[PDB]
Amino acid sequence: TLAGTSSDRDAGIKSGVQTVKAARQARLRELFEREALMYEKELNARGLSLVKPR
Amino acid sequence: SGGVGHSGTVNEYRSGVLIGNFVENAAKI
Amino acid sequence: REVISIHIGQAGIQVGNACWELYCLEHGIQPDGQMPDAFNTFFSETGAGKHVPRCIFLDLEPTVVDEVRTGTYRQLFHPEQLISGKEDAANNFARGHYTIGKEIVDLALDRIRKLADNCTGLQGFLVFNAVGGGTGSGLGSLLLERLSVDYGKKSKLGFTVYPSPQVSTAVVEPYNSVLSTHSLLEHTDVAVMLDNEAIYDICRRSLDIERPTYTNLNRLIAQVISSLTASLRFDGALNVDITEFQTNLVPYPRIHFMLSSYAPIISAEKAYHEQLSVAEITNAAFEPASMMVKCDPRHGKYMACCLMYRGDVVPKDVNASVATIKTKRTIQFVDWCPTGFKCGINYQPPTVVPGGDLAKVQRAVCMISNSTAIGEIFSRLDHKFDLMYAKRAFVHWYVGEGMEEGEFSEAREDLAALEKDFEEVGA
Amino acid sequence: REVISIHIGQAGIQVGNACWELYCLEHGIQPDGQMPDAFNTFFSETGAGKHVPRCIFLDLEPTVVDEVRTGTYRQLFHPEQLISGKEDAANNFARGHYTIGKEIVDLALDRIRKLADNCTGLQGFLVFNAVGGGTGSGLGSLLLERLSVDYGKKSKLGFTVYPSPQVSTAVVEPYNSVLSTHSLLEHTDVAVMLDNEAIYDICRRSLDIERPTYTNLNRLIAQVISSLTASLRFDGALNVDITEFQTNLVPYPRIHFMLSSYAPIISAEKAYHEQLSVAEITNAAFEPASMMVKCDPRHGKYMACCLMYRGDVVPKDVNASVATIKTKRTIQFVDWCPTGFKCGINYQPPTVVPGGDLAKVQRAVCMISNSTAIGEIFSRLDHKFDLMYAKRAFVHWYVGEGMEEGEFSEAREDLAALEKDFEEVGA
Amino acid sequence: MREIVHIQGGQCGNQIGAKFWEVVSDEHGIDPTGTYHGDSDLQLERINVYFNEATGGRYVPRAILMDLEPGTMDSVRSGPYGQIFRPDNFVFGQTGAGNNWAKGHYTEGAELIDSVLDVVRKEAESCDCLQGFQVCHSLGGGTGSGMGTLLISKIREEYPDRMMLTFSVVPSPKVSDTVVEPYNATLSVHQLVENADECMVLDNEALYDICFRTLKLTTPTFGDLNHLISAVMSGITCCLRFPGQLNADLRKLAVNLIPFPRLHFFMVGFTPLTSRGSQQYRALTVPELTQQMWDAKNMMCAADPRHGRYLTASALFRGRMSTKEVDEQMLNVQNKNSSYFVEWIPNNVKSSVCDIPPKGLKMSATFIGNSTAIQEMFKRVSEQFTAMFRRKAFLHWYTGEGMDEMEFTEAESNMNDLVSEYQQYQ
Amino acid sequence: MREIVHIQGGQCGNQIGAKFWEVVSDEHGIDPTGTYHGDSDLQLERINVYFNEATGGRYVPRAILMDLEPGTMDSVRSGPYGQIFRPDNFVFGQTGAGNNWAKGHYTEGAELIDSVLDVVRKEAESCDCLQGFQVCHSLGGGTGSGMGTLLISKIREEYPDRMMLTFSVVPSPKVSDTVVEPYNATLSVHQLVENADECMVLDNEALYDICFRTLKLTTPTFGDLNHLISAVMSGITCCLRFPGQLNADLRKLAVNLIPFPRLHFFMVGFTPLTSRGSQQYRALTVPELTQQMWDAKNMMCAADPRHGRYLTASALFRGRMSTKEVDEQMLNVQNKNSSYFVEWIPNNVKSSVCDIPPKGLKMSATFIGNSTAIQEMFKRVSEQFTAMFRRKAFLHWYTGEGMDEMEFTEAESNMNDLVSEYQQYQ
Amino acid sequence: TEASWAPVHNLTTTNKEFYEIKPEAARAADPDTFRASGPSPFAKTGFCAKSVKGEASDE
Ligand SMILES: Nc1nc2c(ncn2[C@@H]2O[C@H](COP(=O)(O)OP(=O)(O)OP(=O)(O)O)[C@@H](O)[C@H]2O)c(=O)[nH]1
Ligand SMILES: Nc1nc2c(ncn2[C@@H]2O[C@H](COP(=O)(O)OP(=O)(O)OP(=O)(O)O)[C@@H](O)[C@H]2O)c(=O)[nH]1
Ligand SMILES: Nc1nc2c(ncn2[C@@H]2O[C@H](COP(=O)(O)OP(=O)(O)O)[C@@H](O)[C@H]2O)c(=O)[nH]1
Ligand SMILES: Nc1nc2c(ncn2[C@@H]2O[C@H](COP(=O)(O)OP(=O)(O)O)[C@@H](O)[C@H]2O)c(=O)[nH]1
Ligand SMILES: [Mg+2]
Ligand SMILES: [Mg+2]
């Protein structure tokens, strides 16, 4: 289904569109984590580095 | 055991144990 | 020698459905009807390698009957020996006694007659019914009447399911119970009571099943029945037949009501625990914690007892134990009968049903005793019947079905009479 | 053996939010509620494949509570135990004890009743709150009162968070503290103090976190609580249940205030640094550099101490170490209690939390003592209360709520009585 | 075997029975096409109670839908399980009564009842051993109350031996739909006390309260209320449909619950009822079921039973349980709250167990209580009737139809004596 | 023929008893599954003293577990030789006393002691000729001391003609577990001087020092200490279970060791005890056993026997030994250290010889010396009692439950006069 | 989660359970004790009743 019924909003169950959106966000985050782990090695091959948060 | 009655028994062991009647258990023209 | 059993009501054929499982397991009969002469008292051997019990299940609702017809024992139970009415009696004596009785009892006795004709050495009938319901009470009374007028001289051992004082599943069960007694007196020769709260206490205390159901109750009641038919079935050192309960336990034509008991009631692990000997289980079968009927033999006086023993039993120690129970004083006897015991020994140890909670025991005791605590039971039920009848409650169901106040007043005064007899005899 | 835990206030439910994280991580329970008998003291097993904790979070502002209702542990507590009010008490004892309490305590104790009824072997209660705030102080005291009139005979473990002397984040917390003790004296059984600045110095010195948040504080406090209940949850060589603190630690009906401490509080590289054994952790448990309340036990004399050991601890070396402690003279006991110790040894080591700061040590020690430095702490709070009360500052908020000056004067003299009791016991 | 013939009257009857035949068709696993698609053969042996095989497994229900406007008929056949009712069982008028008991009892009935008696008869001798009739209708409306009531009279005059169960919604003042609800309620009740064997009273205030507290719903449409009432009707008929340890048919329940031929107005409950947000909190135990069952807020009537005394009560149970725990719990609720039960009857509780729970559940129960707090409800209606009749407002639309004022006097007297006798046995 | 019933109370007694039944079962050659698997026919002859055959050679111990928390029970059932016990004889409370002697003797005793008395009755008359009772417990605990003591008083009220052995550990200030140790020990001693016939005083401190010096262990856990006490107790009743050249029954030991009815507190020692490194460098002769027996560092109490005199002492030998070597050794040790023995009793050393050593060992011994050095221990405890009682510390958890100040004053008087009479006979 | 979660049928009457699932499971679990003893050593087979009229003819 695309959306939720009237009982879903009370039961707290998220709608189909909401759940698919969240899952998509998180899969994307995984991909960019892999990409960052690759870029760090590619930079240290040259002697430069990414900046890391504090 | 028993609620409002108390039984009187003695335990029975096998042939080897020395009990109240071990000698008679051993006895068995 | 043969004995046939009939089951009436919703309770009747559930006890039968556990009892006949036990018999097939005891004689090693597969549920499909054949093994892979001790059986001849229960199963008749048809044709070649087939057995068909000497039983009739009967009820007025077809639901529990065709549950049996579609259960495990489809091939075992013969099709005709399960009688099924089209509609219930519905907790109503007169309904089960006057309208539907007239249309089912003739077919029942027609069936049972050719059961008795196929039999040869018939000992008697033994019946299983519930007096709280409609079918067991109403046409149970009707069929017992027509059995008594047809055969009569044969024994009719009755195991009846009475209402507990506090635990109750119905409301009009006082009416149905009372109207059942008025025929339970002069049609049953030897009647054994079987309450429910007592067996609930048993399965909670000793077998320690925290959440029991009816099937558990049925299985150990079936164990009791097997333990008192074992004498006819199996070879014993001192046998005791159906004619003995008639003689050694009924000293008066209107006093036939027995307390039953059983020992050892034991779990699977407590069997490893306890040292099972003869004297302590003979003691265990006397305390009210192991009786099948909720009553107190402390406040009553015993009249006569019978003790079936199964298994490895020598007459020496059982005679020694009853000698100790006679020299005890906490339980007391009436001065009428100084030799208030009968024993009976069968060699076969009881079998174990897969899925039951009772372990394999070497020896077992079934005590069927008479007392006056039953005279206390009927008064306890009498009081709560009068409370309801004082307001003419529920009466219109019976009157509209065809009866009147006559059988109400007459059955109420009958219990009053039986009260007078029990207090007179207990003196 | 089962114990339930209630959490009152902004601080209490965050501490509990670390505790339950620790518990599920120790018993192998996934936060969504299922495992992939030792848990039975905390989690009831509803149905199948689900475990719900025996606790109630309650607060008046909904912001922190629905932060839980949306956090990671949504599936652990479903939303009916988490009680939430509509508006906060706002650091106002009278507002929390009289205005909103009268509408929330009935629902709270009605919920705790059927929690206790679901329980069968209730050991006691343990509450989580900070006395500086408004909700944790006011309606906490009201809740403890109604629980004490409910059961009374059951032990109540109050783990309170007191205001640190110089590092403090409120203004009227002296007022709320004093008003809290006035009931915490005559209601709870065993009250454990846990200040904040001592924990700050601990994570600054040993764990060397230089920017610690509240998560790290609540994490190691949860470690102390878990180390307290490990004797109930897991089997050890010398178990000590909740009823023992009631007897072993409280020599008087009013002297129940306990300083806690813990060792070895060690990071992931200092663990490889240090050779860990029983003698040094028994030492480290007693230096003020590892106590959870900023006070100097050198100034005081111990009354009674308790030692919870977890992990790879045999009893010979704990006996040898406490022998060395009793023969050392840098610390001093009272002349009343020659047997000043109570050991306790459990087999399971403390677990780690992924992303936490503590390493997996083989053994650990939770020390819980009783001394007179606490009597010094209460005088420190009483002085800063009397200064602000000298000018009648902030009083009009309490009187505007509906209280008066009488309870202020009587709580003041109550703590004065407590001060006299500690100083006469110290002699 | 034992047969239940369903009768639904008026808009309320049509929609409620629509959801009812939805639940039953679910339980026996028959698709909205009309064919069996379950797995266990336990379901096939007891569909003769509710369905009839026509051709190739086409099981069509034994129900009579009755109304005067085809609008409800189209609302029936718009939803799922609409193409499974026999089109000959769709009797319908053309005018519509609309809140006039007289139109529903003298004019419109005069030409509708003869056709439905044809239908009811044909579908009654179609089965062999009829158990009885089961009716769900309304009391505020006209075409349900008046038409159904007169049909109740006619069938009780033809078949006086069969059973008769009726689910009747009664008006509440707070949720007060129509204006002439007392004029219709009193006349209907005055007929129900003589011809209906026993009546399980319903209303809408109790249901709205239940959906506010227990179920915790935002928009409780009529689809939900119909679903709850349907759950009640399935739980009461479960005994005939499924094997169990202690079967209890309708006549077995009537005799255990009706001590006097006029004291046959029950209040009904249902358990379990919790929100989906709290379904994992709760365990499935008999005490958990019982504490909700004997609760005051779980009755489906607007009468607090703790204002009176229970005369009798019954509890039907579905699912594998332990009869010891069942009976022990019934004994506790009878012993602890000892004042709320009458004294001159011992063991006021009937119990029953059937071994199949409703689909999607594990263990359920159903409560049927004959209490004396129903006289509070009838007084609540009769006093409003006197307020109207005292100056005979709205009376002419009845008077000009055939009815006279004596019918309203008799309705007053019969309501007054009935609440007098309930007050007597309190 | 002679019968010993074993009772276990409290955590310390339960774990000691568990190791004791492990050692005994190993000696009589029954595996933990409960069947007989011994080889020599000397084992069957005296298993009726301790076990009961139930059915098919399943030998269960004649023991009774007693406590208030299931934690000790689970630790008992978990280990091997745990399933041999009686599943019914686990008479067992649910609350937990928790070091409160009033809770163990007044609160929970009142509703658990009826049950344990019933089961100890069952096990008493199940056998014919009792010899005595054997209870293992502590003196600092709450559920061990209090409940065990009240059990002892009830037993002496019932069977006054039977012997009684109580293996009780006494607390030391060096090894001090709980804080109310004097508040429990003084009360239990006050009851044991009037109820029990004789007891064996133990403590963990002397055990720790033994594992330090003579055993040289690095990890002396509780199982090891319990193993030492179990070997001691097995050595005590070796004489009833096996024939010897000079048998010593339990009463025989009592009458030889108790010259005054109140002077019945014993110190115990066991030999031989040698490390696995030095066990190759030693001999096994009677002088070797004797030089290890009369060592002060081998007594299992915190009482230096060189700090007092011996009233009497007994030496129980196990193994094929020279009797002339035995009594000449006892005569030599009594003539050398003539000061340390009492003067007004000649031949202060009772001796006995059994013909069966512990399994695998060649020759062993057990030393039971009724010395007067035990007054140091009671003075060591009574001074702590006075110190706390001077200022009423911890007093109210006892007073508020039913106990009065008179009990504590009476306990002080009896402990003090006991030490006075020991000092008198010194 | 809702879509993946599959509801329960729960169609096992108590008689079918207690007489087919439990005893078969017990027999499979404990093959030692639940075995068919076959003929019983003690039986009341009396060939007197068989004898009073028996003895098949050979003709
Ligand atoms: N102990 C035991 N009692 C049973 C059993 N089955 C039914 N009963 C009892 O039977 C009584 C009610 O009668 P039922 O057997 O249920 O029904 P009935 O006797 O056939 O009467 P009707 O319902 O009118 O047909 C109840 O009180 C039950 O306790 C059973 O299997 N075991
Ligand atoms: N240890 C610890 N203390 C906290 C935490 N959060 C708040 N506190 C302390 O709580 C005290 C004030 O009470 P709060 O818990 O913040 O608030 P409250 O008790 O709910 O009272 P209200 O603010 O009126 O709702 C402050 O002195 C803080 O030091 C925390 O997460 N951990
Ligand atoms: N709960 C519920 N009540 C209904 C439904 N349909 C009608 N009603 C009630 O029926 C009453 C009016 O009935 P009405 O339609 O006038 O009956 P009719 O016109 O004679 O068929 C109102 O109070 C409604 O609450 C329904 O589907 N569910
Ligand atoms: N030898 C030995 N002593 C023990 C053991 N467990 C506890 N103790 C002793 O028991 C004393 C405390 O008694 P406690 O266990 O509290 O008794 P209870 O609580 O009444 O059961 C301590 O001084 C310990 O020395 C053990 O496993 N072995
Ligand atoms: Mg029936
Ligand atoms: Mg706050």
GROMACS .gro file of N, CA, C and O in nm, chain F residues 101-138:
model
  152
 1464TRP      N    1   1.842  -1.310   6.261
 1464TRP     CA    2   1.813  -1.427   6.342
 1464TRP      C    3   1.668  -1.430   6.387
 1464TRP      O    4   1.610  -1.538   6.399
 1465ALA      N    5   1.608  -1.314   6.411
 1465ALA     CA    6   1.466  -1.313   6.444
 1465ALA      C    7   1.381  -1.359   6.327
 1465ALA      O    8   1.277  -1.422   6.347
 1466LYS      N    9   1.424  -1.329   6.204
 1466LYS     CA   10   1.349  -1.376   6.089
 1466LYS      C   11   1.362  -1.527   6.073
 1466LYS      O   12   1.267  -1.594   6.033
 1467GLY      N   13   1.479  -1.582   6.106
 1467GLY     CA   14   1.498  -1.725   6.093
 1467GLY      C   15   1.436  -1.807   6.204
 1467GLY      O   16   1.418  -1.928   6.187
 1468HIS      N   17   1.403  -1.744   6.316
 1468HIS     CA   18   1.358  -1.816   6.433
 1468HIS      C   19   1.218  -1.778   6.480
 1468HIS      O   20   1.161  -1.850   6.561
 1469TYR      N   21   1.163  -1.667   6.432
 1469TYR     CA   22   1.033  -1.624   6.479
 1469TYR      C   23   0.937  -1.598   6.364
 1469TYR      O   24   0.816  -1.622   6.377
 1470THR      N   25   0.988  -1.548   6.252
 1470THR     CA   26   0.899  -1.505   6.145
 1470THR      C   27   0.874  -1.616   6.042
 1470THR      O   28   0.761  -1.660   6.025
 1471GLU      N   29   0.979  -1.661   5.975
 1471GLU     CA   30   0.962  -1.763   5.873
 1471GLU      C   31   0.967  -1.904   5.929
 1471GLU      O   32   0.911  -1.996   5.868
 1472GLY      N   33   1.032  -1.923   6.044
 1472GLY     CA   34   1.029  -2.054   6.107
 1472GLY      C   35   0.888  -2.099   6.137
 1472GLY      O   36   0.855  -2.216   6.121
 1473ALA      N   37   0.801  -2.005   6.176
 1473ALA     CA   38   0.669  -2.042   6.222
 1473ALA      C   39   0.584  -2.109   6.114
 1473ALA      O   40   0.488  -2.179   6.148
 1474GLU      N   41   0.615  -2.089   5.987
 1474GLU     CA   42   0.535  -2.148   5.880
 1474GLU      C   43   0.614  -2.240   5.789
 1474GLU      O   44   0.556  -2.299   5.697
 1475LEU      N   45   0.745  -2.255   5.810
 1475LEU     CA   46   0.820  -2.355   5.738
 1475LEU      C   47   0.858  -2.474   5.824
 1475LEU      O   48   0.877  -2.583   5.771
 1476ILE      N   49   0.869  -2.455   5.956
 1476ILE     CA   50   0.921  -2.560   6.041
 1476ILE      C   51   0.820  -2.673   6.060
 1476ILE      O   52   0.861  -2.787   6.082
 1477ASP      N   53   0.690  -2.645   6.049
 1477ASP     CA   54   0.594  -2.755   6.048
 1477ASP      C   55   0.622  -2.850   5.934
 1477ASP      O   56   0.618  -2.972   5.951
 1478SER      N   57   0.654  -2.797   5.816
 1478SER     CA   58   0.676  -2.883   5.701
 1478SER      C   59   0.804  -2.962   5.715
 1478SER      O   60   0.806  -3.083   5.688
 1479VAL      N   61   0.913  -2.898   5.758
 1479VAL     CA   62   1.038  -2.971   5.770
 1479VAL      C   63   1.030  -3.072   5.884
 1479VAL      O   64   1.092  -3.178   5.878
 1480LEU      N   65   0.953  -3.042   5.988
 1480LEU     CA   66   0.935  -3.140   6.093
 1480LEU      C   67   0.856  -3.260   6.043
 1480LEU      O   68   0.879  -3.373   6.087
 1481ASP      N   69   0.763  -3.237   5.950
 1481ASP     CA   70   0.687  -3.348   5.896
 1481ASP      C   71   0.774  -3.439   5.811
 1481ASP      O   72   0.763  -3.561   5.818
 1482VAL      N   73   0.863  -3.380   5.731
 1482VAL     CA   74   0.946  -3.463   5.645
 1482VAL      C   75   1.060  -3.527   5.724
 1482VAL      O   76   1.101  -3.639   5.693
 1483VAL      N   77   1.111  -3.460   5.827
 1483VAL     CA   78   1.210  -3.525   5.911
 1483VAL      C   79   1.146  -3.632   5.996
 1483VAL      O   80   1.212  -3.729   6.033
 1484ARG      N   81   1.017  -3.619   6.026
 1484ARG     CA   82   0.947  -3.730   6.089
 1484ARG      C   83   0.937  -3.848   5.992
 1484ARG      O   84   0.973  -3.960   6.028
 1485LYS      N   85   0.895  -3.822   5.869
 1485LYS     CA   86   0.884  -3.930   5.771
 1485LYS      C   87   1.015  -4.006   5.759
 1485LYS      O   88   1.017  -4.129   5.758
 1486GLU      N   89   1.127  -3.934   5.751
 1486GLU     CA   90   1.255  -4.002   5.737
 1486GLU      C   91   1.303  -4.064   5.867
 1486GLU      O   92   1.393  -4.147   5.865
 1487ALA      N   93   1.243  -4.027   5.980
 1487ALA     CA   94   1.285  -4.084   6.108
 1487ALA      C   95   1.223  -4.221   6.130
 1487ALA      O   96   1.294  -4.318   6.161
 1488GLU      N   97   1.092  -4.232   6.115
 1488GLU     CA   98   1.025  -4.360   6.132
 1488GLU      C   99   1.033  -4.449   6.009
 1488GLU      O  100   0.989  -4.565   6.015
 1489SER      N  101   1.086  -4.400   5.898
 1489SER     CA  102   1.109  -4.488   5.784
 1489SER      C  103   1.216  -4.592   5.816
 1489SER      O  104   1.217  -4.699   5.755
 1490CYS      N  105   1.304  -4.562   5.910
 1490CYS     CA  106   1.406  -4.654   5.958
 1490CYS      C  107   1.369  -4.700   6.099
 1490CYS      O  108   1.280  -4.645   6.164
 1491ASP      N  109   1.441  -4.802   6.145
 1491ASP     CA  110   1.402  -4.870   6.268
 1491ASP      C  111   1.472  -4.815   6.392
 1491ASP      O  112   1.407  -4.770   6.486
 1492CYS      N  113   1.605  -4.817   6.393
 1492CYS     CA  114   1.683  -4.779   6.510
 1492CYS      C  115   1.771  -4.660   6.475
 1492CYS      O  116   1.878  -4.677   6.415
 1493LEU      N  117   1.726  -4.541   6.512
 1493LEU     CA  118   1.806  -4.421   6.492
 1493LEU      C  119   1.933  -4.428   6.575
 1493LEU      O  120   1.936  -4.485   6.685
 1494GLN      N  121   2.039  -4.370   6.522
 1494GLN     CA  122   2.160  -4.347   6.600
 1494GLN      C  123   2.173  -4.201   6.640
 1494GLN      O  124   2.211  -4.171   6.753
 1495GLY      N  125   2.142  -4.110   6.549
 1495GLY     CA  126   2.153  -3.969   6.581
 1495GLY      C  127   2.115  -3.885   6.462
 1495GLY      O  128   2.075  -3.935   6.357
 1496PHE      N  129   2.130  -3.754   6.480
 1496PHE     CA  130   2.103  -3.656   6.376
 1496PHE      C  131   2.231  -3.581   6.342
 1496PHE      O  132   2.321  -3.566   6.426
 1497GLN      N  133   2.239  -3.534   6.218
 1497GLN     CA  134   2.362  -3.475   6.165
 1497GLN      C  135   2.322  -3.354   6.082
 1497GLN      O  136   2.276  -3.370   5.968
 1498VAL      N  137   2.338  -3.235   6.138
 1498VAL     CA  138   2.297  -3.112   6.072
 1498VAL      C  139   2.419  -3.026   6.044
 1498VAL      O  140   2.501  -3.003   6.133
 1499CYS      N  141   2.431  -2.980   5.920
 1499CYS     CA  142   2.540  -2.892   5.879
 1499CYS      C  143   2.484  -2.753   5.858
 1499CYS      O  144   2.391  -2.735   5.779
 1500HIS      N  145   2.539  -2.655   5.928
 1500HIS     CA  146   2.490  -2.519   5.918
 1500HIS      C  147   2.601  -2.424   5.961
 1500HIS      O  148   2.712  -2.466   5.993
 1501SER      N  149   2.569  -2.296   5.962
 1501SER     CA  150   2.660  -2.192   6.005
 1501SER      C  151   2.610  -2.132   6.135
 1501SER      O  152   2.505  -2.171   6.188
   0.00000   0.00000   0.00000
